[PDB]
Amino acid sequence: IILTDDKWLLKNPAWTKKYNEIEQSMPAINDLSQFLKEQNVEFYFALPPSKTNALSFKLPSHIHTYAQENLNYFLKKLPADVKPIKLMEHFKQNYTNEEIQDMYFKTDHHWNMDGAFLGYQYIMNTIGQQSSIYKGKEIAAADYTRTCAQNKHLVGEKLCYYTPKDGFNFTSVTAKDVQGTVHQNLDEIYGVEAAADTTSYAGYYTDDYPEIVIENNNAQNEVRALVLKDSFANAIVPHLAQSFKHTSILDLRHYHEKDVYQYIQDNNINMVLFVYSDSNLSGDMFKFKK
Structure with a gap:
């Protein structure tokens, strides 16, 4: 299922709330977090924004989508010791809709390399701030060649x-x-x-x-x-x-x-x-235990 507007294509937006789905899959996360906390292993959950979340501003209000509601529920139910890396929230607070749009491909549903590098940057500099074992230099644009x-x-x-x-x-x-x-x-x-x-x-x-x-x-x-x-x-x-x-x-x-x-x-x-x-936020990619 697909939405096209100014030749931007949005695939599979969240037409509905999926709390039941997220709720059912969360115990897998609960158990993995408990197991890792016991071994003193840090657990990070980085969340690149789906294109339909990041570019939801390109939809009329009457067309209701629930990407952020679903993510909020997911974040609310995570164990305290699962450290989420909230990229949509970071992007929204620090970039205009125009700059966020420039972080995705027009027809493909992935973020492009400009978005992904910002994502990588934010992810690692966040871990670098909070971790007890990861130390590394802060990620800087100047250290790369685009x-x-x-x-x-x-x-x-x-x-x-x-x-x-x-x-x-x-x-x-x-x-x-x-x-x-x-x-x-x-x-x-x-x-x-x-x-x-x-x-x-x-x-x-x-x-x-x-x-x-x-x-x-x-x-x-x-x-x-x-x-x-x-x-x-x-x-x-x-x-x-x-x-x-x-x-x-x-x-x-x-x-x-x-x-x-x-x-x-x-x-x-x-x-x-x-x-x-x-x-x-749920489903087959959350099967951790045979």
Whole structure:
């Protein structure tokens, strides 16, 4: 289901309240938070704004949508020890509707790289403020190079990348796809189709993998992070991985080898970060326990 206006396309807005859905899925979060708190493992829940939340101002008032009501309920029911990173609220307080609009693609439903880099920035500088084990330099624009293509077509728009001044310098980047093949470096995963005049967001950034593992001997800490994500993380996966000595990235739509608890123990995880869009508040991506 789709809304088009000034050639902006909005997909699947929240036509209704989903409190029952969020309420039913929340115990999974309750149990994971209890388990992690016991191990002294920090639990962050970052919430990139769904495009239909961020651009809801492009809808007439008579067309009622409930993205923020649903997110508010979700935030209200979270355990106290799950630290939410509230990106929509941050964007709304600090940017005009015009500037927020410039953070998303016109036809594709993801935030573009400009939005995603702000997201990454806000996420890590927030964790850097509150964490007992993550220490890292504050994320600054000047430390990167924004390079853009002026006329790309997502299945013309400006498609950009923010690359570390010194490039991404990872000890290893490894990933297993759904087909079972192993990817052995970052250029086999991220921005594979940067040259293409027409491809998908996945082509331009990354597809969804069951598992991506990055090792980073340059990082100024001993954080072994687990990122649980949906597609909104894809644009900033290596950027997130800059921040930690070890980064595991899982997509629970595709990773079924073991559950979240087994993964945390088998891989000695000591920090957990979700990156789910703020409409992805319940359902299949909240199955943590076999």
